[PDB]
């Protein structure tokens, strides 16, 4: 029980000796030495039940307060923990083995938690406060962080940290999980090798990035690939790959390199494929240019729950760009540039699927027309509560990209896969 | 009559001795001690008929007016008082037991009332004055304060304090009022425990927020719930509830956080149920996506008169978002997302009943088909003027969610409830 | 206007408003125009349904040719039918002719309705008999 009182006393003593206002003075190593010496001198002057190990641990806690993330360090250190949910300063839950449990972890007060949240979301040049209480970001280590501030969250700052697994899935894994039928897997292989301008839509956590990463495995090793990203997610194996990453604006709101700038410059690097990590704003426009003016095979994911919604949001982003283009101009551009719209999506039981493999056939009137090569048919739910369904081909044996497939000598495999799926 | 004169004289003497302008010198506690000493001294220096009891009363009144929330402190202290409505400095009303009544409470003048309002709204850091005459805020204790300043309010500052009604109706209370037959109550228990996505329709004041709060008593405690609201009304007793709340735009349109933004963010908080306070705008779309993408158990109340009109309203809201989805796409979304629509309604005689427990069976052609488990057949009118009706099960033995009910082991309870309903 | 209707349709029954129009149908059209001016992205049918659900009565006053003012209608928003709002006038001022001084001559007559749309609302407050008597007396002509 003396741990809390000892910590408070040591914090007061450290502030008296080395105050937080002296930041950048007595830096990381200097602080690690000075605070340790001060804690030793205090343990000598001020009697405490803390032993030598306890004194070293108090020095460690001071180090955390000066350098670390507070009581989250024990949790983030562990690897079996998949999610950390803070729900205010006095209730920290953790997901272990797929089940949520309450931990005996407690922040000092909502101010400590609200400062730690700002510290965590500052790693990517982002700030969350009463000016903008909602903040979603992804850390370098490969985890997602969501924060809501006290103005909205009544109970206090709410922090959600999902630590996603490192190793990714291959198309073989997707076939194993029944995510896509093997015939669909062969058609996807043809599409990836055939150099089709495909857009991978989907919902949050639906599998967009994983699907893109599995599709890039079909890229011919001789091609010059350029991958524009925000978090260095993709893991390509080709030898001739150029990896780019946008730079978030600094604290002064200057020096930013938006994804739009990266894509615009990628047109100068003479790449054979541009792979946008995710389309969010005006860069959509530029990406289509790349898809249209010779860089066939360019891929890029976006957030949407169906091909129609994905196309609508592409139009919305292009309009946000402010180029003053009419609606039908944008629709003609989309129809000319995009070939396939693979639709990832999560099902009502939480399991992922590839629900559609669409195809922008053409533009009629003012509405774009598409035909699904595959569709997910849900039949019901099994005794375990999991959604049951099957991937059915619509029978189309002449996709609009047939010429591309033939030019590379893959039309035979495409026809074989489509007719084998049609046999069912 | 001498009480007012003595109080005024003692206040002047205290200001002469202990100046309220001396802030940071003789502060709250020192101010109270000095006020007590000064009142004791002036009792003899300023001959007042007030005895020891009246002397202490005046001491406390000085301590309040100097520091506290003026004459409001008694009203805020009581627990039966639900609302406090001050129209100027002379017409303080209060709501007790559902009845608004005037009270013999007055303020010195409008300046005192405005200062009190400024002190009250300063707890949450907001300020109200002739510069920004309107202030709506939520105090830390759950009460809501609304203040309007003299420039707009002709009669003087207007204050409205709505305390948090901390007692709600349970399901058994709704049964006692003959609002839902006990068989219907147990069917609702099965539906809530079985985590079926449900929309709670109803008209104005028909009592659908209360029904939602009763339904949220069946949520399994181990589930992470996230409730979005415009004004905090639900009181969930589970230990894992996360409470959010929209922020309306200020007078200049900045700092707005719509329910749509909250519901979109909640998809990234890893919830297991999203419980939207009330669906009015485009957020319906997001909510349905939450229902579709694995967050089974999500709820939400909307304003409609019949389940068919509720579905039409959902379609209209989803179209209002401007996502460019055709009608049949939205209808398929609604069919796949919603499972049970519960219809509350307030009848002619001022009574409130639950008139439908509908299930969205599926699509026939271009119109969504529904089947009612329960219906309130209104026969006629009591001679007293009341309306007379009976709850009856439509005879549907196995509801659409029978498999879902069985997966949780509640098939026995559902069968018993529907047999008892059918056995009458 | 939008907010006002929202107030009328969220428990604040009894609210009142005034606008500038010559006929109740013109008043409804101008309400739709204002709500569209709000810029909330609501289609016409949504606004018409909102007007139907919120408003109950529309009292149309007017100033006549001879400068005289007379309440010319007491209309009721009966409900939507297709894409047009239906209305029924409880009272109307029928202009029969002119006086010898150039004045306008007319009479207030009820359209004979006995059960207006707000019959239940009136009954809930113990006024159904007053309304019935008033309408019957008006219909006695
Ligand atoms: N078909 C699938 N089967 C199983 N898990 C999947 C599948 N697709 C994606 N995932 C899981 O989703 C997580 C990554 O989702 P991701 O698509 O990268 O996020 P986003 O779609 O938001 O970019 C990984 O942890 C991975 O295990
Ligand atoms: N079945 C019922 N019988 C009697 N009174 C009820 C019933 N349900 C709710 N009430 C009361 O009526 C009020 C309804 O308000 P509320 O539930 O907020 O309706 P809404 O949210 O639709 O406006 C509540 O204050 C509650 O005390
Ligand atoms: Mg991604
Ligand atoms: Mg309500």
Author numbering:
A (entry chain F), B (entry chain A): 80 to 503
C (entry chain B): 363 to 503
Study authors write:
We show that CpaF assembles into a hexamer with C2 symmetry in different nucleotide states. Nucleotide cycling occurs through an intra-subunit clamp-like mechanism that promotes sequential conformational changes between subunits.
To understand how different nucleotide states might regulate CpaF assembly and conformation, the structure of CpaF was determined by cryo-EM in the presence of ADP and Mg2+. Henceforth, this CpaF structure obtained in the presence of ADP is termed CpaFADP. CpaFADP formed a C2 symmetric hexamer with dimensions and subunit packing similar to CpaFAMPPNP. However, ADP/Mg2+ was now bound in each nucleotide-binding pocket. In CpaFADP, the map around the nucleotide binding pocket was now fully ordered with the P-loop well resolved. Crucially, HIS box residue H382 was turned away from the nucleotide with P-loop K287 fully engaging the β-phosphate just like in CpaFAMPPNP open state. Broadly, this means that when ADP/Mg2+ is bound to CpaFADP in the open state, then the nucleotide binding pocket of the open’ state subunit resides in a conformation similar to the open state of CpaFAMPPNP.
